[PDB]
Design an enzyme around this catalytic site. Structure first.
Site, PDB file in Angstrom:
ATOM      1  N   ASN A 128       0.809  -1.208   0.000  1.00 24.63           N
ATOM      2  CA  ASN A 128       0.000   0.000   0.000  1.00 24.63           C
ATOM      3  C   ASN A 128       0.847   1.264   0.000  1.00 24.63           C
ATOM      4  O   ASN A 128       1.956   1.290   0.540  1.00 24.63           O
ATOM      5  CB  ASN A 128      -0.923   0.005   1.225  1.00 24.63           C
ATOM      6  CG  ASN A 128      -0.257   0.599   2.457  1.00 24.63           C
ATOM      7  OD1 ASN A 128      -0.176   1.820   2.602  1.00 24.63           O
ATOM      8  ND2 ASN A 128       0.234  -0.263   3.347  1.00 24.63           N
ATOM      9  N   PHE A 181      -0.897   8.633   3.928  1.00 29.21           N
ATOM     10  CA  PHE A 181      -1.543   9.327   5.043  1.00 29.21           C
ATOM     11  C   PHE A 181      -2.844  10.042   4.672  1.00 29.21           C
ATOM     12  O   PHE A 181      -2.993  11.233   4.939  1.00 29.21           O
ATOM     13  CB  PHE A 181      -0.587  10.356   5.660  1.00 29.21           C
ATOM     14  CG  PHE A 181       0.448   9.769   6.582  1.00 29.21           C
ATOM     15  CD1 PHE A 181       1.589  10.493   6.907  1.00 29.21           C
ATOM     16  CD2 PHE A 181       0.284   8.508   7.131  1.00 29.21           C
ATOM     17  CE1 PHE A 181       2.550   9.966   7.765  1.00 29.21           C
ATOM     18  CE2 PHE A 181       1.240   7.975   7.989  1.00 29.21           C
ATOM     19  CZ  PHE A 181       2.373   8.702   8.306  1.00 29.21           C
ATOM     20  N   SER A 199       6.541   5.415   8.316  1.00 29.59           N
ATOM     21  CA  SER A 199       5.747   5.249   7.109  1.00 29.59           C
ATOM     22  C   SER A 199       6.663   5.396   5.901  1.00 29.59           C
ATOM     23  O   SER A 199       7.431   6.354   5.800  1.00 29.59           O
ATOM     24  CB  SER A 199       4.644   6.295   7.026  1.00 29.59           C
ATOM     25  OG  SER A 199       3.951   6.176   5.793  1.00 29.59           O
ATOM     26  N   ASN A 245       5.566   5.762   2.878  1.00 30.09           N
ATOM     27  CA  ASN A 245       4.828   6.497   1.855  1.00 30.09           C
ATOM     28  C   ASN A 245       4.770   8.013   1.996  1.00 30.09           C
ATOM     29  O   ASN A 245       3.934   8.667   1.369  1.00 30.09           O
ATOM     30  CB  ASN A 245       3.414   5.931   1.754  1.00 30.09           C
ATOM     31  CG  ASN A 245       3.410   4.425   1.585  1.00 30.09           C
ATOM     32  OD1 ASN A 245       4.019   3.893   0.656  1.00 30.09           O
ATOM     33  ND2 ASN A 245       2.731   3.728   2.490  1.00 30.09           N
ATOM     34  N   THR A 246       5.653   8.564   2.820  1.00 31.89           N
ATOM     35  CA  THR A 246       5.735  10.010   3.010  1.00 31.89           C
ATOM     36  C   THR A 246       7.207  10.395   2.917  1.00 31.89           C
ATOM     37  O   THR A 246       8.028   9.946   3.722  1.00 31.89           O
ATOM     38  CB  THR A 246       5.167  10.450   4.379  1.00 31.89           C
ATOM     39  OG1 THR A 246       3.738  10.326   4.366  1.00 31.89           O
ATOM     40  CG2 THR A 246       5.537  11.898   4.667  1.00 31.89           C
ATOM     41  N   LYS A 280       6.746   4.192  16.579  1.00 32.84           N
ATOM     42  CA  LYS A 280       6.608   3.091  15.633  1.00 32.84           C
ATOM     43  C   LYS A 280       7.746   3.150  14.627  1.00 32.84           C
ATOM     44  O   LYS A 280       7.900   4.134  13.898  1.00 32.84           O
ATOM     45  CB  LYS A 280       5.259   3.164  14.913  1.00 32.84           C
ATOM     46  CG  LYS A 280       4.991   1.992  13.985  1.00 32.84           C
ATOM     47  CD  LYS A 280       3.509   1.894  13.627  1.00 32.84           C
ATOM     48  CE  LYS A 280       3.211   0.644  12.802  1.00 32.84           C
ATOM     49  NZ  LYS A 280       1.748   0.461  12.604  1.00 32.84           N
ATOM     50  N   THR A 309       6.814  -3.936  13.810  1.00 35.30           N
ATOM     51  CA  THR A 309       7.286  -2.824  12.973  1.00 35.30           C
ATOM     52  C   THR A 309       6.191  -2.334  12.009  1.00 35.30           C
ATOM     53  O   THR A 309       5.053  -2.806  12.032  1.00 35.30           O
ATOM     54  CB  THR A 309       8.439  -3.265  12.033  1.00 35.30           C
ATOM     55  OG1 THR A 309       7.898  -4.111  11.008  1.00 35.30           O
ATOM     56  CG2 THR A 309       9.510  -4.046  12.784  1.00 35.30           C
ATOM     57  N   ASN A 310       6.571  -1.402  11.140  1.00 35.88           N
ATOM     58  CA  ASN A 310       5.672  -0.866  10.124  1.00 35.88           C
ATOM     59  C   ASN A 310       5.872  -1.760   8.895  1.00 35.88           C
ATOM     60  O   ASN A 310       6.451  -2.845   9.003  1.00 35.88           O
ATOM     61  CB  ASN A 310       6.054   0.581   9.783  1.00 35.88           C
ATOM     62  CG  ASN A 310       4.869   1.399   9.287  1.00 35.88           C
ATOM     63  OD1 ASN A 310       4.170   0.999   8.360  1.00 35.88           O
ATOM     64  ND2 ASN A 310       4.642   2.554   9.908  1.00 35.88           N
ATOM     65  N   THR A 311       5.403  -1.321   7.731  1.00 38.52           N
ATOM     66  CA  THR A 311       5.572  -2.115   6.515  1.00 38.52           C
ATOM     67  C   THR A 311       6.999  -1.964   5.987  1.00 38.52           C
ATOM     68  O   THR A 311       7.697  -1.004   6.325  1.00 38.52           O
ATOM     69  CB  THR A 311       4.569  -1.693   5.406  1.00 38.52           C
ATOM     70  OG1 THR A 311       4.636  -0.275   5.202  1.00 38.52           O
ATOM     71  CG2 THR A 311       3.145  -2.084   5.793  1.00 38.52           C
TER      72      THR A 311
HETATM   73  C1  LIG Z   1      -3.659  -0.658   3.868  1.00 40.67           C
HETATM   74  C2  LIG Z   1      -2.708  -0.387   5.053  1.00 40.67           C
HETATM   75  C3  LIG Z   1      -2.697   0.855   5.675  1.00 40.67           C
HETATM   76  C4  LIG Z   1      -1.822   1.156   6.803  1.00 40.67           C
HETATM   77  N1  LIG Z   1      -1.857   2.400   7.404  1.00 40.67           N
HETATM   78  C5  LIG Z   1      -1.051   2.650   8.448  1.00 40.67           C
HETATM   79  C6  LIG Z   1      -1.068   3.959   9.122  1.00 40.67           C
HETATM   80  O1  LIG Z   1      -1.811   4.886   8.773  1.00 40.67           O
HETATM   81  N2  LIG Z   1      -0.230   4.118  10.156  1.00 40.67           N
HETATM   82  C7  LIG Z   1       0.676   3.111  10.649  1.00 40.67           C
HETATM   83  O2  LIG Z   1       1.389   3.370  11.595  1.00 40.67           O
HETATM   84  N3  LIG Z   1       0.694   1.900  10.027  1.00 40.67           N
HETATM   85  C8  LIG Z   1      -0.103   1.648   8.992  1.00 40.67           C
HETATM   86  N4  LIG Z   1      -0.083   0.416   8.372  1.00 40.67           N
HETATM   87  C9  LIG Z   1       0.848  -0.602   8.887  1.00 40.67           C
HETATM   88  C10 LIG Z   1       0.232  -1.642   9.824  1.00 40.67           C
HETATM   89  O3  LIG Z   1      -0.229  -0.948  11.021  1.00 40.67           O
HETATM   90  C11 LIG Z   1       1.290  -2.687  10.279  1.00 40.67           C
HETATM   91  O4  LIG Z   1       2.428  -2.007  10.921  1.00 40.67           O
HETATM   92  C12 LIG Z   1       1.884  -3.505   9.103  1.00 40.67           C
HETATM   93  O5  LIG Z   1       0.939  -3.617   8.008  1.00 40.67           O
HETATM   94  C13 LIG Z   1       2.303  -4.910   9.535  1.00 40.67           C
HETATM   95  O6  LIG Z   1       1.205  -5.686  10.025  1.00 40.67           O
HETATM   96  P1  LIG Z   1       0.387  -6.745   9.130  1.00 40.67           P
HETATM   97  O7  LIG Z   1       1.412  -7.630   8.406  1.00 40.67           O
HETATM   98  O8  LIG Z   1      -0.414  -7.540  10.135  1.00 40.67           O
HETATM   99  O9  LIG Z   1      -0.473  -5.966   8.153  1.00 40.67           O
HETATM  100  C14 LIG Z   1      -0.943   0.098   7.252  1.00 40.67           C
HETATM  101  C15 LIG Z   1      -0.971  -1.168   6.594  1.00 40.67           C
HETATM  102  C16 LIG Z   1      -1.821  -1.439   5.523  1.00 40.67           C
HETATM  103  C17 LIG Z   1      -1.786  -2.828   4.895  1.00 40.67           C
HETATM  104  O1  LIG Z   2      -0.935   5.776   4.889  1.00 40.52           O
HETATM  105  C1  LIG Z   2       0.070   5.202   4.498  1.00 40.52           C
HETATM  106  O2  LIG Z   2       0.604   5.222   3.357  1.00 40.52           O
HETATM  107  C2  LIG Z   2       0.915   4.313   5.398  1.00 40.52           C
HETATM  108  C3  LIG Z   2       1.359   4.764   6.592  1.00 40.52           C
HETATM  109  C4  LIG Z   2       2.176   3.870   7.425  1.00 40.52           C
HETATM  110  O3  LIG Z   2       2.609   4.195   8.510  1.00 40.52           O
HETATM  111  N1  LIG Z   2       2.417   2.604   6.880  1.00 40.52           N
HETATM  112  C5  LIG Z   2       1.959   2.139   5.645  1.00 40.52           C
HETATM  113  O4  LIG Z   2       2.236   1.002   5.267  1.00 40.52           O
HETATM  114  N2  LIG Z   2       1.185   3.028   4.890  1.00 40.52           N
END
Ligand SMILES: Cc1cc2nc3c(=O)[nH]c(=O)nc-3n(C[C@H](O)[C@H](O)[C@H](O)COP(=O)(O)O)c2cc1C
Ligand SMILES: O=C(O)c1cc(=O)[nH]c(=O)[nH]1
Ligand SMILES: O=C(O)C1=C(C(=O)Nc2c(F)cc(-c3cccc(OC(F)(F)F)c3)cc2F)CCC1
Length: 364
Positions: A113, A117, A183, A185-186, A223, A251-253
């Protein structure tokens, strides 16, 4: 349907839903249904955990991103989550990147994704949480905490001020706040994970936090990404202990693309989540736990889809775990599944409860 059967949702409903709706539309409908309670296991004392100045009836929460604007908080607790986290929320409203910005990789049980934000902004979310502030107070007292994830605007000039504003507006309505600086994506956001930048940012955030009245004073977590060098992790661990950061979300993505991905959309720009991220995430938890001497509470996130996935992260050092991508593939029933398998695994491995398993790998 309402019965809540794991096979039905996994094999029939979810697949059909995704075969008729694109990723983003599916997500929006998901939020709608959850907010309305259109959803399909009793937590045992074993799953109860106490951290961040709160009690959690179960350690399984919904990661940030599913409910970005705080529209389905209650429907999420009803889904079985031990705690909910909304966001990321930016100070001013913003649309995020242009569609399409979310992609499914079903062959990898992953998602990519690049939302950027997209957010309703602090004000809208503020009033939305205020409308249920008292209900949440009782939920929290009942072991069902609320976390708020903070982001920053794309055209913002002072990153620190953006988070400072979030702390002031939403901090009074949350059990814990999340400084999202991972993130992918920023532009330039992750650079804030740097030692000098991070220290100045967190010093200001914590100051704004300490200025809030006692009952409205949230714990502050940071995070981080799964793509940090060994140096970044050492620095983050150092700053965290220097400033008294309350905890870490790991962690985050990932912006990496592990060899083996099969999805046709594997080369799309964005953060990767799901199974391909799981272990990379668990290892980051293992490392941060050791760097902080196990004294800093960690919320493990990244590819959790089963009790085993949850327990590996807990044994690696996580006090709590979160999931998101797993929900998009298996649906609501996955929550009860993870909790049930986690409980069985704890017993099967001799742990009296979740608390006993936290960091267990480091003591063996
Ligand atoms: C569609 C999507 C939107 C996300 N938006 C955010 C976000 O706004 N802020 C954030 O800290 N993480 C965001 N994440 C990250 C998730 O909170 C998480 O850290 C990451 O996807 C790993 O967990 P998972 O494998 O269970 O999805 C997003 C993930 C996905 C797939
Ligand atoms: O909104 C998003 O693009 C976003 C934020 C974030 O923290 N992590 C992510 O995977 N997407
Ligand atoms: O799906 C995707 O590709 C993506 C996301 C997504 O948001 N998915 C998704 C979905 F579509 C549907 C439900 C759901 C929620 C409640 C009840 C339910 O059951 C019934 F419908 F029966 F009410 C089903 C949960 C989900 F998590 C995020 C981006 C990619």
């Amino acid at each position: 349907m309402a019965t809540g059967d794991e096979r039905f949702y996994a094999e029939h409903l979810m697949p059909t839903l995704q075969g008729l709706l694109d990723p983003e539309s599916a997500h929006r409908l998901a939020v709608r249904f959850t907010s309305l309670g259109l959803l399909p296991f009793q937590d045992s004392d074993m799953l109860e955990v106490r951290v961040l100045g709160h009690k959690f009836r179960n350690p399984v929460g919904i990661a940030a991103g599913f409910d970005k604007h705080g529209e389905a908080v209650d429907g999420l607790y009803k889904m079985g989550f031990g705690f909910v986290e909304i966001g990321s929320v930016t100070p001013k409203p913003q649309e995020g990147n242009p569609r399409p910005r979310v992609f499914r990789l079903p062959e990898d049980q992953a998602v990519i994704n690049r939302y950027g934000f997209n957010s309703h902004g602090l004000s809208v979310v503020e009033h939305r949480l205020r409308a249920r502030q008292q209900k949440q107070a009782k939920l929290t007292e009942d072991g069902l905490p609320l976390g708020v994830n903070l982001g920053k605007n794309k055209t913002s000039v002072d990153a620190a001020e953006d988070y400072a504003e979030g702390v002031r507006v939403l901090g009074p309505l949350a059990d814990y706040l999340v400084v999202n600086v991972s993130s992918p994506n920023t532009a330039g956001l992750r650079s804030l994970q740097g030692k000098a930048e991070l220290r100045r940012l967190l010093t200001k955030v914590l100051q704004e936090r300490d200025g809030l009245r006692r009952v409205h004073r949230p714990a502050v977590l940071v995070k981080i990404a799964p793509d940090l060098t060994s140096q970044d992790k050492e620095d983050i661990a150092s700053v965290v202990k220097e400033l008294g950061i309350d905890g870490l979300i790991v962690t985050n993505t990932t912006v990496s693309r592990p060899a083996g991905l099969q999805g046709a959309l594997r080369s799309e720009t964005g953060g990767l989540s799901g199974k391909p991220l799981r272990d990379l995430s668990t290892q980051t938890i293992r490392e941060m736990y050791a760097l902080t001497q196990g004294r800093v509470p960690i919320i493990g996130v990244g590819g959790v889809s089963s009790g085993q996935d949850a327990l590996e992260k807990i044994r690696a050092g996580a006090s709590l775990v979160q999931l998101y991508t797993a929900l998009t593939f298996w649906g609501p029933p996955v929550v009860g599944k993870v909790k049930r398998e986690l409980e069985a695994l704890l017993k099967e491995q001799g742990f009296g409860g979740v608390t006993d398993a936290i960091g267990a790998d480091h003591r063996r």
